[PDB]
Amino acid sequence: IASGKVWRDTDGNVINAHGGGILFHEGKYYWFGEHRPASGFVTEKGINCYSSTDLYNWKSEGIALAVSEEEGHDIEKGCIMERPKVIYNAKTGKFVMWLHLELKGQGYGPARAAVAVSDSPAGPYRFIRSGRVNPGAYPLNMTRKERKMKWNPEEYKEWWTPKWYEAIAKGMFVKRDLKDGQMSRDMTLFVDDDGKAYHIYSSEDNLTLQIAELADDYLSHTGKYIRIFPGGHNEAPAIFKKEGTYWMITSGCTGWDPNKARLLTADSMLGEWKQLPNPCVGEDADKTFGGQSTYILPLPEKGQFFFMADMWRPKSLADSRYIWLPVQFDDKGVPFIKWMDRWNF
Ligand SMILES: OC[C@H]1O[C@@H](O)[C@H](O)[C@@H](O)[C@H]1O
Ligand SMILES: OC[C@H]1O[C@@H](O)[C@H](O)[C@@H](O)[C@H]1O
Ligand SMILES: [Ca+2]
DSSP states (O other): OOTTSOOBOTTSOBOOOEEEEEEEETTEEEEEEEOOOSSSSSOSSEEEEEEESSSSSOEEEEEEEEOBOSTTOTTBTTSEEEEEEEEEETTTTEEEEEEEEEOTTSTTOSOEEEEEEESSTTOOOEEEEEEOBOTTOOOTTSOHHHHHOOOOGGGGOSTTSHHHHHHHHHTHHHHHTTTTOBOOOSEEEEEOTTSOEEEEEEETTTTEEEEEEEOTTSSSEEEEEEEESTTOOOEEEEEEEETTEEEEEEEOSOTTSOOOOEEEEESSTTSOOEEESOSEESTTGGGGGGOEEEEEEEETTTTEEEEEEEEOOGGGGGGOEEEEEEOEEOTTSOEEEEOOSSOOO
């Protein structure tokens, strides 16, 4: 594994699977990610898939979730499709893909999540719907008192005042968004020990992370969710569980520019989370080695985990590279990440 270099599939073509993630099913790894074009910032083709038995050699499986050709469709060509993730639902035997969708021609304003489903890992995936998350529902961890507070929008027009920040912390944008649903941009999925799945996403104008329970078929949200680090600008979440404890790596909010990573931890998915120092160590750790978090893959056969990141190139997004590095653990069990030029499983 040679982070930062040009990686090619088994036909000699450049691997094009950004903002991605991996699952293992019936003996093979499947890597889903954004097909990015050589120019621009929209999705021309959709979500790409690659497969491998060894994590070194990747066969192109083609587009797993294609853009629609129907005019006015949610995923019409020219929408923005980002950070796709796939989880296998054991109950229904289906593959469920969630992704960040922004409607064609509307920049990043819509802030939706979208869901699609397939009987096979590589697709084709069938689009079901898009929208903002859990319309009408409050977070479990907003008290009755906090839920009663009202916030006149004309009094809070200026961002980053003391009163505005407090208001954001106490849930002013949760209430603003309560009718039509919570905003969802950068996102991930996690399937827990008990078969419950969670949708983790940057909400409230990117200011606040939310963690939402999915229904038993993984196709919708139950209404149960929490909100964490309000005003923190945690983005690009990646998450794993080890020995009962949850660990989440996130970026800051600086568009395509790299920034300092954060480590977050909890002893229950919907309990209280705490922030720890940057998990990246050594030279360039302050810039996440020039990358941005996308996924943490468990390798449960080994009791190991590895960290996947993107090295973004906004001038030609298809030239964006991949950083994959092992997760290491200190003598207290706290995960950390060191750069290695080349490494092996
Ligand atoms: O993100 C997709 C959304 O779809 C909506 O129809 C639903 O009301 C939301 O709770 C959410 O599941
Ligand atoms: O909007 C430009 C980019 O901003 C990043 O912060 C985000 O993680 C990406 O998925 C993309 O949306
Ligand atoms: Ca958001």
